[PDB]
Amino acid sequence: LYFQGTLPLWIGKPGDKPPPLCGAIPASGDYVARPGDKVAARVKAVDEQWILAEVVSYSHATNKYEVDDIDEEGKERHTLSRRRVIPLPQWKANPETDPEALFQKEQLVLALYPQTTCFYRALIHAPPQRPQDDYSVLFEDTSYADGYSPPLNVAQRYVVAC
């Protein structure tokens, strides 16, 4: 009710690799997202910007997605090369069992910024040590002399490779 789309914790058995789209584990090279899946989509801005979007369809003929920008005003459609679409994780990685499926300190990532529907460049400050905790990240911010925000929390749901 309150937390629509919250991610399940990956629980693997012996000898199971953390799968593609578990935390930091990348999608396979031929991966195709389904209608309804959430993605980071690189679109033209005013400049380009990674936005939170929802897949509408994919054409294997053109290798282009149709995606809808998720905004409060209503949807805007974009047609994008698969090169401009990063699938969001479908599981959160459990640091207690699959710590290697988390982005490590200082890794460059794209992360959702608070009170936006956009992804921006950030460095990992700390991966979570417990499954109930999120990432701490430093966002690039050119308004500050050293170029970075203070540490801000971002759920695994909204941190992807840059």
């Binding site: 910007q49 920008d69 998720i70 905004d71 910024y113 009170q115 936006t116 529907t117 956009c118 921006y120």
Partner: peptide, 4 residues
């Protein structure tokens, strides 16, 4: 999209 809502930007920062």
């Amino acid at each position: 999209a809502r930007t920062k």
